[PDB]
Amino acid sequence: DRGVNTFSPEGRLFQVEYAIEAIKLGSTAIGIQTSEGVCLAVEKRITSPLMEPSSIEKIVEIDAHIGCAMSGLIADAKTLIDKARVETQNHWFTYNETMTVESVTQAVSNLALQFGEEDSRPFGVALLFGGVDEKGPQLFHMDPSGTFVQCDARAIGSASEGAQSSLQEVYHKSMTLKEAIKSSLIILKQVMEEKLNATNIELATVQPGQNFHMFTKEELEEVIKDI
Amino acid sequence: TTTLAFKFRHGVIVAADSRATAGAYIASQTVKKVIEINPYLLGTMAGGAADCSFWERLLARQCRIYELRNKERISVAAASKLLANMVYQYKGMGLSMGTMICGWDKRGPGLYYVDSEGNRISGATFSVGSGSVYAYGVMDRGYSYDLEVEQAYDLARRAIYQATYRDAYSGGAVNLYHVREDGWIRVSSDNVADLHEKYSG
Amino acid sequence: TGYDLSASTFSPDGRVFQVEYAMKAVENSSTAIGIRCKDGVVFGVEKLVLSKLYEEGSNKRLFNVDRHVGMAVAGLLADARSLADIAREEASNFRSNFGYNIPLKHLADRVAMYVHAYTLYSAVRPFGCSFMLGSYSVNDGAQLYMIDPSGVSYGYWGCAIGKARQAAKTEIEKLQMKEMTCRDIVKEVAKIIYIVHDEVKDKAFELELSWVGELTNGRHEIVPKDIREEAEKYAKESLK
Amino acid sequence: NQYDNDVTVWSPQGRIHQIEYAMEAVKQGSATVGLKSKTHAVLVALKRAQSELAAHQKKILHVDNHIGISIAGLTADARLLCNFMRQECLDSRFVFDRPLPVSRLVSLIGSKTQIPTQRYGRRPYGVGLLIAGYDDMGPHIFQTCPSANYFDCRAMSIGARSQSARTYLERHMSEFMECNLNELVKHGLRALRETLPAEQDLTTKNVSIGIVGKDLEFTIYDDDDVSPFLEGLEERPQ
Amino acid sequence: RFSPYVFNGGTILAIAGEDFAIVASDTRLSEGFSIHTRDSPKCYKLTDKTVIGCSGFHGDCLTLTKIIEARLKMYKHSNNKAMTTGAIAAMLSTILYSRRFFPYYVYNIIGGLDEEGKGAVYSFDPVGSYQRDSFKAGGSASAMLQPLLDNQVGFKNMQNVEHVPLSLDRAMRLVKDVFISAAERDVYTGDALRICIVTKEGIREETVSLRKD
Amino acid sequence: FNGAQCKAVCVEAGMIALRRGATELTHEDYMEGILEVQAKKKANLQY
Amino acid sequence: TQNPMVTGTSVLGVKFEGGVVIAADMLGSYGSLARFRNISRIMRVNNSTMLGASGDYADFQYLKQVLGQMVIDEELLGDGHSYSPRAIHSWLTRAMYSRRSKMNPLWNTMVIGGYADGESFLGYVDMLGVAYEAPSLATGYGAYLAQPLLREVLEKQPVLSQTEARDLVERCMRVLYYRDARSYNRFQIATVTEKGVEIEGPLSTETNWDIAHMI
């Protein structure tokens, strides 16, 4: 199978299936669409006390209303985040408006699976996209293979099976914001290994009336102590 | 076309006219000359509309990229420098552009002046345009550093009134912008004839 | 069995096995014959419907390269399409550079060099096609050529490309080929194609016949085969 | 089997197996059915999802004012040929100021997909195009293949378990030619309801229909002008 | 020598209403001291809420019209929705600067509806600036038409004259009167009038002749 | 469909009537064998 | 071409009921010397459209070659689809504009006449890319001289017959023979209908000079 330019006798992706396998080792993250707004969470998996917690990036800021989360390999995510930032600014250049999140993720998956060493390798990252377009809030999930789809509440990376199962247990269409936030961090502290405290996780919530500051900073402590 | 800017203790004052002629013929009366780059930057239009508009929009693009990469708001001198570096690459090919750069800094007030000839310089007072000398005259009459707010408003407004009263290439609405520590704030939009009735006596 | 991977390498006995394997690729393809008369060249291809999914008028192997030249390809179809485009391009250069119709020898030599150039290097494979080239001119008569997968290009009176390569030319050569005009040769090719493989391995086939010569005044097009309907009323008389 | 790795290598039986593997990669897409009348061409596909909560991955996508394609297989090559398709459409729409005939466009598609099937360094395109269009002579239903041997039909169906669909198309291809839009579309989904296992039924959110007409611009429909299309049925003969 | 430009002339008008944008233009195409035709409408209907007019050099007008149509189809076929008016204005400004150093000799006026359902006219210059104004007159008869619109639309230079909002049929009688009055003195104006009306319900057109000289 | 498949079909139908515990073989179970895995899988279907 | 060497002269074309007639003369003057007094200035494109031109004759030979090859290519596609005359008009307009954008213009003045699918077509292409439709075209000095006769009769009678059109073309070519310095008493009439494309022979004019017997 050795090589990105040879199919299988059956239906194997190989140069891509091994990437979809390479997603699974990363840290988990959970984003949930609600009509009130999109919330999002992640686990850092802090190793050392010297490991400064605010320097690890999982949620970065693409636009004033477009958030993100990464997975697995760090630097392919850095490449895609850099280019995604550049292209939304190009959209604002030629259109005086905000590139909507579906158009953002199509713009990413134009080259999210475009790996060619001649005429480079496929990328090793899963991405969770949340944003507020004209149609309200949106939650979006892509993959290394560019097979981009909308998801109402997608969970990635490690332990995503039980995350999806226990997520489909509690979720429905007419949920609220804070209920989904604590339902997410319940799933988090069922799938993490360490004690849930101020430094493990970080939230990212975007509202149509609260487009700015898609983050909660140590009021997250108050959210965790309410469980 | 006559713009001016001067900084003082309480931030920066920016005023401009709104007339943009075409030779001897006036096109419009309400040309918004002070191009709003950011919620913390204000660029102007000083010689040529399209050139100033394009290069300041591209500068705004670059500034937004810079902030989203560093999570830290750009300085004023860096933006003026980036504009001068982008403008210098077409020297001699016929660019007319004499804009001004204003904004608030970690250092505080910031006031730079970028030409199509690339004369990036700091300073405290500037004025660009055909009838800029009139504004220089009455402004360097009324200038100080310890001025009040309404004093500076009346100074700039009187200055632009004198400029449009004497010059032929100036007129239209008198804009007046005020750069603060937090962000810029539009003051008022006053017509020439209203100022003529008010200040003629 | 030892070294037959690259198209650049030789064998311990001195031949290129890539070219042989590409030559016998067209052997499994459909049977396509051709024959010329004293005032024209006639093509004919045994074409088969898959089961019932075709439309009888798709993917016609009878191409039309120049105003007076067309192909009668057999083998891999898309490779033949690309080669037909190259032949159209070569006739385009000749018409643009010299102001008159391309002689078939020069066209065949350029096409043979193009096919040979795809047989030379190791990055590319040899073609999997074998096709026919017919022509007619007022100062030249009728010319029918033939290009193998290797690039050996020379001339015939009659030929056959497909399974029944020998089994067509067994009874092609007993035709009195010189003394006939092509309007007899139409039903002759009809009976030759109709002889081979009525029902034995497959279920059903279908006939196409191309047509160039003096009767078209130098044009090349498919026959109105429905006009004079010359196969079936003689095909039903060719079973006895 | 050690000759069975690359596109360049001819087999000792002459069948380049990379082409066969690309065919088998096409065979694992979704089911889809396209069929035309004398005046209207209809292609109907089937949607799937990653999970229950997520939306369905779409198949019918727009190309041009009179051209629309179905798809099966890979999606990067799908969007690649989509961008090339739109590009060649707006190229001739710019230059000649006319809509394209469909046959020359699909010949350009075959010539496009020829190069990654002959040189070394690109893969054959896993792709499942079903093309509906309007030249001067009415509707056309073409299909492609990763071997670039494009076909013209009157009714085809590609994807998973699409053969029962083909049997239905065999036993109604004589009946297809006369009817107007509505029963034509319900013949299409009376192929799709046999492209499914019998223990579940075709709902709203999983089906998609795209009609192009001789006076009608190409238009995709989803659940709401499909709720009119889903009634007018009986149950399967259990 | 070969001159790359020629002055074809033409006259384009625009009026931004409360909920309508009227764009009208003559259909005379001339050159020097000749008449090429008496039917060439400068107006073009892009969407259901956007009409563009293009005067000046005609070949550049045709090229620019077709490029704008192509990018309209690119935005629609990429993002599942039509453009706004200001997006079309921004895109045209990007194009006009993208050929800065060999300019189109074309005046441009885009009329249309905004997203609030109100009239919006975005003018242009040959080099690529734009602004949202209430009325513009582009082409040869610009100076014959701007001060009268200053008198009627803007209600300028008047005393004790209140400001009534400009209705539709009043605007129709205005457009007909200003084209008659400008075609009396202009040499590049007459022989027809193509009036385009953009409402919240579609586009209406109307053909009113003029004097035949 | 080669012998083995068909043999696997009829044995499947036998064991299907055995599921309910029948005394006979219904063409329903025969069609079940016909429409069994047919030694075909699976799919994922995976993207 | 910066400097036109060998120029033609005026081309006349006018629609009628189900056809377009085009006539141009057969002169190849260089400067003032009528160097090539037997040349053909109308190409009969395949079966519907038809081309006539002015300006540099070599560029017309060039465009004859290119258009002939393109029409041959589409006819060898075998799809049953041809070029509409408006498509030819569009391609030629784009060709001239992209020619002149590179500051190397083709010195021509071309007339495209065609009849396809019930509707006639008569298009104009300038060197600068100026292109439009018209019920009657007149090039060179014809736009100064024979244009008002065309516009008189089309105002006096909006539709025409083939005979009236042919007689009017004969009169206009007579007038152009009277007072164009670059003109010649040998012309060919070309006509398209639904019956095909027809090029008539080298006709001539019947002149009058009875004013010369006056002082």
From Swiss-Prot, chain B:
It comes from the Eukaryota. The active site is at 1 (nucleophile). The keyword Glycoprotein does not apply. The keyword Membrane does not apply. GO terms for biological process: proteasome assembly; proteasome-mediated ubiquitin-dependent protein catabolic process; proteolysis; response to oxidative stress. It is found in: Cytoplasm; Nucleus. Its EC number is 3.4.25.1. Its main location: cytoplasm. Keywords: Cytoplasm, Host-virus interaction, Hydrolase, Nucleus, Protease, Proteasome, Threonine protease, Zymogen. Induction: Down-regulated by IFNG/IFN-gamma (at protein level). Induced in breast cancer tissue. Up-regulated by sulforaphane in breast cancer cells. Bortezomib binds at residue 49. It catalyses: Cleavage of peptide bonds with very broad specificity. It is an enzyme of class 3 (hydrolase). GO terms for molecular function: endopeptidase activity; peptidase activity; threonine-type endopeptidase activity. GO terms for cellular component: centrosome; cytoplasm; cytosol; extracellular exosome; nucleoplasm; nucleus; proteasome complex; proteasome core complex. Component of the 20S core proteasome complex involved in the proteolytic degradation of most intracellular proteins. This complex plays numerous essential roles within the cell by associating with different regulatory particles. Associated with two 19S regulatory particles, forms the 26S proteasome and thus participates in the ATP-dependent degradation of ubiquitinated proteins. Belongs to the peptidase T1B family. This is Proteasome subunit beta type-5. It comes from Homo sapiens. The chain holds residues 60 to 260 of 263 of the full protein.
Swiss-Prot record, chain C:
SMART domains: Proteasome_A_N (SM00948). It comes from the Eukaryota. It is found in: Cytoplasm; Nucleus. The modification N6-acetyllysine is found at residues 52, 201, 225. Keywords: Acetylation, Cytoplasm, Host-virus interaction, Nucleus, Phosphoprotein, Proteasome. GO terms for biological process: proteasome-mediated ubiquitin-dependent protein catabolic process. GO terms for molecular function: ubiquitin protein ligase binding. Its main location: cytoplasm. GO terms for cellular component: cytoplasm; cytosol; extracellular exosome; nucleoplasm; nucleus; proteasome complex; proteasome core complex; proteasome core complex, alpha-subunit complex. Coiled coil: none annotated. The modification Phosphoserine is found at residue 238. Induction: Down-regulated by antioxidants BO-653 and probucol. Up-regulated by bacterial lipopolysaccharides (LPS) and TNF. Belongs to the peptidase T1A family. The 26S proteasome consists of a 20S proteasome core and two 19S regulatory subunits. The 20S proteasome core is a barrel-shaped complex made of 28 subunits that are arranged in four stacked rings. The two outer rings are each formed by seven alpha subunits, and the two inner rings are formed by seven beta subunits. The proteolytic activity is exerted by three beta-subunits PSMB5, PSMB6 and PSMB7. Interacts with AURKB. Interacts with CDKN1A. Interacts with MDM2 and RB1. Interacts with the C-terminus of TBXA2R isoform 2. Interacts with DNAJB2. (Microbial infection) Interacts with HIV-1 Tat protein. This is Proteasome subunit alpha type-3. It comes from Homo sapiens (Human).
From Swiss-Prot, chain E:
The modification N6-acetyllysine is found at residue 176. Its main location: cytoplasm. It is found in: Cytoplasm; Nucleus. The keyword Glycoprotein applies. One of its GO terms (biological process) is proteasome-mediated ubiquitin-dependent protein catabolic process. The modification Phosphotyrosine is found at residue 122. Keywords: Acetylation, Cytoplasm, Deafness, Glycoprotein, Host-virus interaction, Intellectual disability, Nucleus, Phosphoprotein, Proteasome. Belongs to the peptidase T1B family. Non-catalytic component of the 20S core proteasome complex involved in the proteolytic degradation of most intracellular proteins. This complex plays numerous essential roles within the cell by associating with different regulatory particles. Associated with two 19S regulatory particles, forms the 26S proteasome and thus participates in the ATP-dependent degradation of ubiquitinated proteins. The 26S proteasome consists of a 20S proteasome core and two 19S regulatory subunits. The 20S proteasome core is a barrel-shaped complex made of 28 subunits that are arranged in four stacked rings. The two outer rings are each formed by seven alpha subunits, and the two inner rings are formed by seven beta subunits. The proteolytic activity is exerted by three beta-subunits PSMB5, PSMB6 and PSMB7. Interacts with SERPINB2. Interacts with RFPL4A. (Microbial infection) Interacts with HIV-1 protein Tat. PANTHER family: METALLOPROTEASE TLDD, PROTEASOME SUBUNIT BETA TYPE-1. This is Proteasome subunit beta type-1.
Swiss-Prot record, chain F:
Belongs to the AAA ATPase family. It is linked to Deafness, cataract, impaired intellectual development, and polyneuropathy: An autosomal recessive disease characterized by early onset of deafness, cataract, severe developmental delay, and severely impaired intellectual development. Patients later develop polyneuropathy of the lower extremities, associated with depigmentation of the hair in that area. The chain holds residues 391 to 437 of 439 of the full protein. Component of the 19S proteasome regulatory particle complex. The 26S proteasome consists of a 20S core particle (CP) and two 19S regulatory subunits (RP). The regulatory particle is made of a lid composed of 9 subunits, a base containing 6 ATPases including PSMC3 and few additional components. Interacts with PAAF1. It is found in: Cytoplasm; Nucleus. Sumoylated by UBE2I in response to MEKK1-mediated stimuli. This is 26S proteasome regulatory subunit 6A. The lineage of its organism: Eukaryota, Metazoa, Chordata, Craniata, Vertebrata. It comes from the Eukaryota. It comes from Homo sapiens (Human).
